[PDB]
Design a protein around this ligand. Structure first.
Ligand code: CLA
Ligand code: CLA
Ligand code: CLA
Ligand code: CLA
Ligand code: CLA
Ligand code: CLA
Ligand SMILES: CCCCCCCCCCCCCCCCCC(=O)OC[C@H](CO[C@@H]1O[C@H](CO)[C@H](O)[C@H](O)[C@H]1O)OC(=O)CCCCCCCCCCCCCCCCC
Ligand SMILES: CCCCCCCCCCCCCCCC(=O)OC[C@H](CO[C@@H]1O[C@H](CS(=O)(=O)O)[C@@H](O)[C@H](O)[C@H]1O)OC(=O)CCCCCCCCCCCCCCC
Ligand SMILES: CC(=O)O[C@H]1CC(C)(C)C(=C=C/C(C)=C/C=C/C(C)=C/C=C/C=C(C)/C=C/C=C(C)/C=C/[C@@]23O[C@]2(C)C[C@@H](O)CC3(C)C)[C@](C)(O)C1
Ligand SMILES: CC1=C(C#C/C(C)=C/C=C/C(C)=C/C=C/C=C(C)/C=C/C=C(C)/C=C/[C@@]23O[C@]2(C)C[C@@H](O)CC3(C)C)C(C)(C)C[C@H](O)C1
Ligand SMILES: CC1=C(C#C/C(C)=C/C=C/C(C)=C/C=C/C=C(C)/C=C/C=C(C)/C=C/[C@@]23O[C@]2(C)C[C@@H](O)CC3(C)C)C(C)(C)C[C@H](O)C1
Ligand code: SF4
Lengths: 659, 95, 185, 79, 192, 192
């Protein structure tokens, strides 16, 4: 199609991986095969990422020196080869005659060290092997493409005599879309047997590497101590091995649940769902499966974010002031993204996958939810309003009283429920000890109570927006016929009072801001309590403490990184602090100023180009005629700028303050 | 032109006509298609009595080169009746 | 056509040397042979640096190999090449004089676009190999050592272009510099 | 290094640097050979993904297609 | 009877009588796999583990030929080295016994170029194997077009030659496995 | 009929069917009747072998390694031959030749071979995709091993199968009693 504008690129890039929207993707067979191949390529990318990390650790870094003195030493991420740096004098990242290096804040050093890596040769062998695994993944993608092509050819060449041969149309993608066998093998082999295999790895490599004296592998390597070994300040490796052994056994047992290879054994998921409380749903729906997987991944990512910090599993990881914060924040952000992703894909499932029954029929869980979506949304709004009103009001009361200089006048509600739960947990742990757990129990005060209620507000409002989008995706009082329109469309016009941000994609756009806010609140809470436990406990009850003792006070090293006096190793962090501020501010433009103004401006610019003497005779403007970004395109671009600035301006701050 | 013989909400569900002519345009389906899809969604609520499609026997596959259309339809119908009788016997065994 | 890729929409022949079909065929054959020899010669330059066959450790690598290897050994090598060139003829019914029935199983019964792609890849690799082998031989002759060893000792910019980059970060060899960094570029 | 971190300056944390690079030129070359194999395979995979499935193959392609017995058993079992 | 079950549908299918069923000659209590038909060595249908029920017979035949050839070369080389044959050269003559030869040559630095050459040929073999399996080129499993001149013209003699190759490779598999295991166990020459 | 017409449920007296299923397990789980018959015959076979294996060692003992073959009685024979591995069926890797005394014994070898035979016969007959009728009531416990010996007459074949089943059941009970009595009294053959 030669007739095109510059919006062509953005329209394509917004759905490059929306395989269901592809032209000439006739059937679910094509859809599933394309998705499988994309998955293989994704695994190849992950393996190449692992191989690159390992290679750079081996070559550009100091793993061998670090493992000798892990406590004061700092791992190297990779060298800096940037021509723009000053050549007259040494940079802050060099030893005045040495290649510039970057410190590593990913904990991969601790990971390798407690896995059992002793020499750079082992890291090199791993780099090589993971590259080979990437090759294997790509070749498997090719193999499966060929096998599925060979089945289509067969079905074309051979036909059942009876007219029911068309029934085979449904079973061509059975290997990719079968649920019982996939569940059995995933939960039994990919999870349980993988855990058992890692137990074997620990017993064979990690335990001997950690233990100075040689001792034959035996049940003595399996223990149920708890807490952190004093020397490494981490969970006993012997306990990790038992842990994984136990989980592996349990999940290997659970992996015989469904009928996978024969119909003589196992039960059916259709049958469980039919007989259970949830009536039934489109288990075949790829969007629904993606939503469930994303929800599970989000909860697991949050769990690891909390537990890696609480119970240190890696040698000397706790000693690394910066790496702990970086890991927690990283996995918290990933978890938030995965949660909002699950919600967005549930909305998409409702839009284009769910087969709604007739209105009066109420047989499925989704229909039952749609019956009282109004009640759900109203109650969620009530909870959000209560939390916001009271949290903000108590914080403002404390703010005003502190500003007037009377801390005694502050409202300080003791967290009695959380303290009782914590005391019960401590009682259980003390009983176990009589038969250390660091950071699993924390002082907990009224400031913690207020911050927890703020985080609850954030979660409730995010879920409010996402649930409203999902439950109004098919229809709404303002736009009853929303099923016909795509998942994301600009608007419905200025009629009916105006219909800005009326689509389910627009609800996601809105919930993205909240996710970022609630995640920022969580990260600020963790970082403040981590940096200054005592000051946080005493002063975190009013917002001026957050604005002064946390942001303004700890912002000094970052902004002072590079100045008229000189530069230090945080100069890069200071430049990325400002670059990300600028990106956020740019996102404000696409978020505030909308398309008509920019289309008219583009028209004027195009007029100028067409009136320019030399340029007109070469460039007509007919092909890829410039245009202003569409409404949805600009919404997304502004959201991307906002998200990039917000997310990327934090790591510089945390590194500066914790380093 | 572009006239639809039903209320605006009379359009078929987008998810119902998937991988068909109207893959993502439920507002362009013909009235007959809308009626057929509506009747299908009404029919598929009665789970207890829905004929489960018999699983094909992949062994009985022959080349296309290797009769009458009506005769093959009749043979298919005999096969379907045999399948239904077998299902009835199997279910009545234990009930 | 064969030998024409995306960067050049039409055949590249500014001097119109391939005016006639006979001359075009002769030039195609010569170019194919030259590209093949150049490709093997370029791997030939790179691989002895990595390793040497047993008994070949003493011999010099590049143009110095001409003096180092015995004249008898060079005679034997040229005799082998001449025997191959004189006792091997294009396979009857082949694509032309450039083919000798070596690996034709892979190209038999394939789609013509794929055959054209394979031929064009052969030709393009041969051309790049001609350019690269001339670069390698010229650099070896000028700087007295094989280009790979020379780059290991001096880097990508060595003793001929280092003057341009004498003030660059990680490549700064200017007089009075606090670091030499000349061998790392 | 010119550290800019308060904790780094206070505790004297250091970024030790080895005397010799961890890997040699031959090792880097081997890793690059593996990476080149990955790149060739990845380009082939990208081409396959771009072009998708080809249902016309039954008209001209050699052979008569084949379904593995296990795949047939899965089809018979159903979903 | 080569059909697993006769009938348009599974639930109403009928199975051939056991006397009619075609049973494997190697293991008489299993039916003939029926996928390794027209291949070399099919005369004794032997696939109790049902590997061919998951992998195309092309892959397993390629792997079998590769293993048999590698094991034949390995056993002849191990026997020669144990008997004492060695390359004329200081580095090759220094090594005393075959068991330590792998480590000695890895240290000496020959095994790295050797593995490089083998890996180059193996990448070519992988490309060729994928081409032949996908049928882009007209190739059979484990066919590299080497020595096609000596291949008998008659179809029966060609099949006999291929069967001899496969049987000798199968024998060499066990031969080398036993040789290496016994050598590692005891520490003596090939005759043991 | 009863238990899907399987053999072995007939009383010694002519005209009366013993049909011993006190728990009604056949009716409760009819779809597993071929598997039950296979398991019954396998238990009977292992037991008929194991009883003679309890008796003969007293008369003769092969002179293997004395770590086990010097066992006082059949009760301790299993513990002696199983070795003392760090885990029940785990080979010692650091000390392969059992110098530390923590290596699996010959029972591990026989167990590995039994596992290979099982995976290649029973799992092969039951789970193979290329064997669709697979394990049924008619062929349960039949691996075609020696089937050329049984009498041609179908009635005589049924009688021989019944003899096998009865002898296997008697051997199951006899081995249970023999091993338990050996454990309790630790005496020779009369209490095995
Ligand atoms: C979560 C609860 C649950 C429920 C309600 C059912 C219900 C059912 N299952 Mg079961 N099943 C479960 C879990 C469950 N299953 C799990 C976890 C597995 C994996 C091991 C299986 C695997 C399974 C198979 C393979 C089959 C069934 C079948 C059945 C049916 C018969 C049950 C029966 O006879 O039990 C009474 C029998 C027992 C209580 C004996 C069970 C003994 C084994 C060893 C399992 C016990 C494992 C234990 C709970 C975990 C050990 C953990 C470790 C730390 C020690 C019935 C519909 C059968 C059916 O008809 O399917 C259509 C069938 O074929 N189930
Ligand atoms: C062309 C672009 C493209 C790309 C690059 C990918 C990439 C991916 N897709 Mg795919 N996908 C695509 C298009 C694409 N997809 C399209 C168009 C669709 C149709 C809607 C899908 C539908 C789809 C589904 C349905 C799924 C994927 C998944 C994946 C992953 C593949 C395997 C992997 O490496 O996981 C690496 C992942 C891990 C190492 C993490 C494993 C842990 C999982 C994710 C969570 C398990 C939770 C469990 C169910 C519950 C726990 C309970 C506990 C809390 C008590 C990867 C992120 C899978 C995935 O992981 O989704 C999140 C998946 O389930 N995709
Ligand atoms: C500091 C800035 C700010 C503030 C104060 C609020 C306040 C509110 N937002 Mg939020 N919101 C913000 C920025 C902010 N938003 C941004 C930048 C966006 C992106 C466009 C959104 C997008 C958004 C959406 C889409 C929704 C909310 C909702 C809400 C309500 C949450 C419940 C609550 O706290 O009630 C207590 C009220 C207050 C704290 C306001 C102060 C009242 C006096 C002064 C005390 C509340 C009116 C949800 C809502 O309406 O829930 C009912 C909702 O659906 N907001
Ligand atoms: C920091 C935030 C930000 C930024 C960067 C801009 C930028 C711009 N706005 Mg403004 N704008 C903002 C916020 C911002 N706005 C907000 C929040 C709103 C909503 C109220 C608006 C509303 C708005 C309107 C309504 C209009 C503008 C206009 C403009 C343009 C002014 C002319 C120009 O481009 O000269 C300066 C350009 C820059 C400073 C951009 C950065 C240039 C850097 C320094 C150099 C680039 C270096 C290099 C080449 C980068 C290569 C990178 C690559 C290799 C990866 C410019 C694109 C006007 C316009 O378009 O006039 C023509 C206009 O009409 N803006
Ligand atoms: C005695 C050895 C020997 C012999 C008999 C030949 C013979 C030939 N070479 Mg030569 N050639 C030789 C050694 C030899 N070469 C060696 C050692 C090399 C280095 C690899 C080459 C590299 C070479 C190239 C690159 C080309 C020839 C070409 C030719 C042909 C050109 C016609 C002619 O005789 O002039 C002819 C068949 C040309 C040809 O075939 O043109 C059609 C051609 O392009 N040769
Ligand atoms: C057909 C099998 C069989 C036979 C012939 C015998 C015979 C005998 N048993 Mg018995 N016994 C059997 C099976 C059998 N048992 C089984 C299956 C068990 C359980 C595994 C036992 C457990 C058992 C015990 C515990 C004892 C006997 C004892 C005896 C003796 C007195 C009763 C007698 C020699 C008693 C005896 O004299 O032991 C030495 C005795 O104490 N038996
Ligand atoms: C770096 C760390 C910090 C930052 C983290 C990243 C930022 C946060 C993520 C953004 C938040 C939203 C994420 C959701 C994504 C899907 C949304 C979507 O498709 O809707 C985006 C929608 C989709 O498009 C709409 O689709 C609708 C159908 O649903 C209709 O057809 C609409 O008309 C159509 O506009 O809008 C767009 O088309 C957006 C325009 C996209 C332009 C991008 C082109 C430039 C790309 C350059 C960058 C490289 C890209 C590759 C990245 C490499 C990474 C390895
Ligand atoms: C490392 C250690 C490795 C050990 C691996 C052990 C593997 C076990 C092998 C037995 C499994 C065989 C199988 O699944 O085939 C399927 C057949 C069904 O028959 C089948 O029935 C099929 C049709 S249908 O399924 O009946 O519809 C038919 O096609 C088929 O021919 C027929 O045999 O299996 C059975 O008959 C059921 C036996 C179940 C035994 C489970 C015991 C588990 C412990 C319980 C406590
Ligand atoms: C033009 C072109 O392209 O090239 C041509 C060239 C040419 C020649 C035509 C070709 C060929 C064919 C070739 C080279 C064929 C080679 C075949 C070999 C080397 C076979 C070895 C078998 C060893 C066995 C069975 C050992 C068996 C050993 C056993 C059984 C040992 C058994 C015991 O050791 C064990 C295991 C323990 C000991 O204690 C006891 C004993 C019994 C000694 C080409 C490559 O195709 C094409
Ligand atoms: C063609 C033909 C015939 C022929 C022929 C003949 C005799 C051909 C002979 C060909 C011959 C003798 C070909 C050697 C290749 C060696 C290679 C590729 C080595 C690569 C080695 C590599 C890539 C190793 C690389 C490295 O690992 C190293 C070593 C060190 C590590 O740090 C890492 C790196 C990556 C740097 C017949 C049979 C006579 C008739 C037939 O009709 C036609
Ligand atoms: C059916 C029937 C009837 C009946 C009946 C009845 C009551 C049947 C009872 C059967 C019963 C009760 C059968 C026990 C078997 C026990 C076994 C096999 C134990 C093996 C134990 C073994 C192999 C142990 C071995 C070892 O421990 C040893 C020795 C030493 C250790 O170092 C090593 C190990 C652990 C390996 C009626 C009632 C008469 C009615 C009708 O008329 C017919
Ligand atoms: S054009 Fe913009 S302002 Fe007007 S109705 Fe649509 S979204 Fe709202």
């Amino acid at each position: 199609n030669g007739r095109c504008a510059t919006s062509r690129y953005l329209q394509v890039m917004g759905s490059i991986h929306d395989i269901e929207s592809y032209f000439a993707l006739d059937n679910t067979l094509s859809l599933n095969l394309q998705i499988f191949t994309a998955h293989w390529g994704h695994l190849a990318i992950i393996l190449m990422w692992i191989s690159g990390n390992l290679y750079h650790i081996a070559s550009n870094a100091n793993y061998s020196l670090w493992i000798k003195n892990p406590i004061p030493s700092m791992p190297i991420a990779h060298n800096i080869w940037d021509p723009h740096f000053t050549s007259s004098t040494s940079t802050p990242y060099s030893h005045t005659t040495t290649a510039a290096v970057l410190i590593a804040y990913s904990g991969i050093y601790n990971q390798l060290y407690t896995s059992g890596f002793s020499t750079v040769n082992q890291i090199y062998k791993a780099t090589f092997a993971f590259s080979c695994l990437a090759v294997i993944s790509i070749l498997l993608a090719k193999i499966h493409i060929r096998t599925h092509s060979e089945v289509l050819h067969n079905s074309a060449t051979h036909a059942s005599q009876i007219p029911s041969f068309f029934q085979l149309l449904y079973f061509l993608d059975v290997g990719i879309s079968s649920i019982n066998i996939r569940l059995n093998f995933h939960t039994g082999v990919l999870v349980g047997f993988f855990s058992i295999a890692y137990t074997g790895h620990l017993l064979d490599v990690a335990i001997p590497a950690s233990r100075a004296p040689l001792s034959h592998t035996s049940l003595s390597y399996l223990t149920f101590f708890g807490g952190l070994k004093s020397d490494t300040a981490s969970l006993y490796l012997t306990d990790i091995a038992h842990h994984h052994l136990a989980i592996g056994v349990i999940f290997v047992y659970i992996g015989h649940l469904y009928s996978s290879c024969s119909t003589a054994l196992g039960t059916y998921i259709r049958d469980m769902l039919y007989t259970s409380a949830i009536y039934m749903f489109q288990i075949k729906s790829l969007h629904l499966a993606l939503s469930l997987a994303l929800a599970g991944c989000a909860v697991l990512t949050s769990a690891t974010a909390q537990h890696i910090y609480s119970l240190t599993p890696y040698f000397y990881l706790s000693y690394d002031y910066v790496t702990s914060v970086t890991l927690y924040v990283h996995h918290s952000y990933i978890a938030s993204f995965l949660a909002i992703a699950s919600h967005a894909h549930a909305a998409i499932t409702l839009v284009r996958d769910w087969v709604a029954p007739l209105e009066l029929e109420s047989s499925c869980t989704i229909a039952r939810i749609h019956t009282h979506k109004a009640a759900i949304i109203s109650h969620l709004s009530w909870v959000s309003l209560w939390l916001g009103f009271h949290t903000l009001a108590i914080y403002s009361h404390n703010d005003t009283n502190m500003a007037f200089g009377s801390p005694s006048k502050q409202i300080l509600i003791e967290p009695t429920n959380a303290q009782l739960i914590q005391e019960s947990s401590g009682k259980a742990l003390y009983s176990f000890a009589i038969n250390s757990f660091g950071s699993f129990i924390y002082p907990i005060g009224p400031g913690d109570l207020y911050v927890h209620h703020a985080i609850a507000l954030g979660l409730h409002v995010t879920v409010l927006i996402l649930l409203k989008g999902a439950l109004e995706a098919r229809g709404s009082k303002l736009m009853p016929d929303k099923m016909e329109h795509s998942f994301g469309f600009s608007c419905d016009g200025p009629g009916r009072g105006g219909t800005c941000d009326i689509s389910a994609w627009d609800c996601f756009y809105l919930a993205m801001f909240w996710m970022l806010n609630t995640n920022a609140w969580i990260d600020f809470y963790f970082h403040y309590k981590y940096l200054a436990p005592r000051q946080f406990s005493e002063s975190s009850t009013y917002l001026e403490s957050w604005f002064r003792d946390y942001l303004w006070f700890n912002s000094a090293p970052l902004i002072r990184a590079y100045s008229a006096l000189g530069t230090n190793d945080l100069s890069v962090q200071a430049w990325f602090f400002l670059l990300t501020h600028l990106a956020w501010a740019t996102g404000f433009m696409f978020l505030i100023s909308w398309r008509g103004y920019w289309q008219e401006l583009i028209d004027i610019i195009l007029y100028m180009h067409l009136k320019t003497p030399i340029l007109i005779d070469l460039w007509n403007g007919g092909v890829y005629t410039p245009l202003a970004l569409s409404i949805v395109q600009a919404r997304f671009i502004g959201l991307v700028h906002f998200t990039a600035g917000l997310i990327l301006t934090y790591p510089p701050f945390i590194i500066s303050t914790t380093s | 032109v572009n006239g639809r013989p039903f209320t605006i909400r009379g359009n078929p569900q987008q998810s119902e006509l998937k991988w068909t002519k109207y893959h993502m345009k439920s507002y362009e389906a013909d009235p007959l298609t809308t009626l057929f899809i509506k009747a299908r969604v009404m029919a598929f609520q009665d789970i207890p009595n829905l004929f489960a499609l018999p699983q094909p026997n992949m062994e009985e596959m022959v080349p296309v080169e290797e009769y009458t259309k009506q005769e093959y339809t009749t043979r298919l119908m005999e096969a379907l009746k045999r399948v239904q009788d077998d299902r009835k016997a199997k279910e009545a065994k234990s009930l | 056509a064969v030998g024409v890729c995306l960067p050049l929409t039409d055949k590249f022949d500014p001097l119109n040397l391939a005016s006639t079909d006979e001359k075009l065929e002769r030039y195609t054959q010569v170019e194919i042979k030259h590209g093949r020899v150049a490709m093997i010669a370029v791997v030939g330059y790179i691989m002895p640096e990595i390793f040497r066959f047993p008994g070949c450790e003493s011999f010099q690598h590049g143009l110095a190999a001409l003096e180092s290897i015995p004249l008898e050994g060079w005679v034997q090598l040229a005799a082998l090449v001449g025997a191959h060139e004189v006792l091997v003829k294009p396979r009857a019914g082949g694509l032309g004089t450039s083919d000798f029935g070596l690996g034709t199983e892979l190209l038999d019964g394939i789609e013509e676009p794929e055959l054209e792609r394979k031929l064009t890849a052969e030709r393009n690799n041969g051309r790049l190999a001609m350019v690269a082998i001339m670069g390698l031989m010229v650099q070896d002759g000028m700087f007295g050592e094989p280009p790979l060893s020379y780059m290991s000792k001096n880097g990508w910019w060595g003793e001929g272009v280092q003057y341009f980059v004498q003030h660059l970060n990680n490549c700064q060899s200017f007089s009075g510099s606090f670091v030499d960094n000349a061998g790392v570029c | 290094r010119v550290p800019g971190g308060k904790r780094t300056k206070e505790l004297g944390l250091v970024v030790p640097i080895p005397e010799e690079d961890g890997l040699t030129d031959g090792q880097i070359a081997a890793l690059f050979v593996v990476a080149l194999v990955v790149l060739i395979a990845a380009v082939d995979l990208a081409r396959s993904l771009y072009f998708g499935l080809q249902p016309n193959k039954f008209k001209t392609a050699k052979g008569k297609g084949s379904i593995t017995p296990f795949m047939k058993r899965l089809i018979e079992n159903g979903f | 009877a080569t059909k697993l079950s006769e009938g348009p549908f599974i639930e109403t299918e009928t199975y051939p009588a056991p006397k009619e069923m075609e049973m494997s000659a190697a293991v008489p209590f299993l039916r003939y796999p029926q996928v390794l038909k027209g291949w070399v060595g099919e005369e004794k249908g032997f696939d109790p583990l049902g590997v061919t029920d998951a992998l195309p017979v092309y892959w397993v035949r390629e792997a079998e030929l590769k293993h048999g050839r590698v094991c034949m070369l390995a056993t002849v080389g191990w026997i020669a080295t144990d008997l004492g044959m060695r390359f004329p050269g200081d580095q090759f003559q220094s090594v005393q016994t075959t068991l330590e030869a792998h480590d000695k040559m890895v240290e000496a630095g020959l095994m790295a170029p050797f593995l490089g050459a083998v890996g180059t040929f193996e990448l070519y073999s992988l490309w060729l194997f994928f081409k032949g399996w996908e049928m882009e080129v007209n190739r059979d499993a484990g066919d590299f077009f080497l020595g096609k001149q000596f291949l008998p013209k008659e179809p029966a003699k060609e099949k006999d030659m291929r069967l001899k190759e496969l049987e000798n490779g199968r024998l060499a598999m066990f031969a080398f496995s036993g040789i290496v295991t016994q050598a590692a166990m005891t520490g003596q020459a090939w005759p043991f | 009929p009863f238990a899907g017409g399987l053999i072995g449920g007939e009383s010694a007296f002519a005209g009366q069917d013993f049909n011993f299923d006190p728990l009604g397990l056949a009716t409760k789980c009819e779809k597993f009747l071929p598997w039950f018959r296979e398991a019954e015959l396998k238990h009977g076979r292992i037991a008929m072998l194991a009883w003679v294996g309890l008796v003969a060692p007293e008369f003769v003992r092969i002179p293997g390694p004395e770590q086990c073959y010097g066992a006082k009685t059949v009760v301790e024979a299993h513990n002696a031959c199983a070795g003392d591995p760090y885990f029940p069926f785990i080979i010692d890797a650091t000390d392969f030749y059992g110098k530390d005394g923590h290596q699996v014994g010959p029972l591990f070898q026989v167990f590995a071979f039994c596992g290979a035979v099982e995976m290649l016969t029973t799992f092969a007959k039951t789970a193979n995709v290329s064997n669709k009728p697979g394990l049924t009531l008619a062929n349960a416990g039949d691996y075609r091993l020696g089937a050329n010996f049984l009498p041609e007459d179908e009635a005589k074949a049924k009688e021989m199968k019944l003899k096998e089943l009865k002898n296997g059941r008697l051997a199951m009970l006899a081995f249970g009693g023999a091993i338990t009595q050996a454990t309790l009294t630790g005496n020779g053959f009369p209490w095995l």
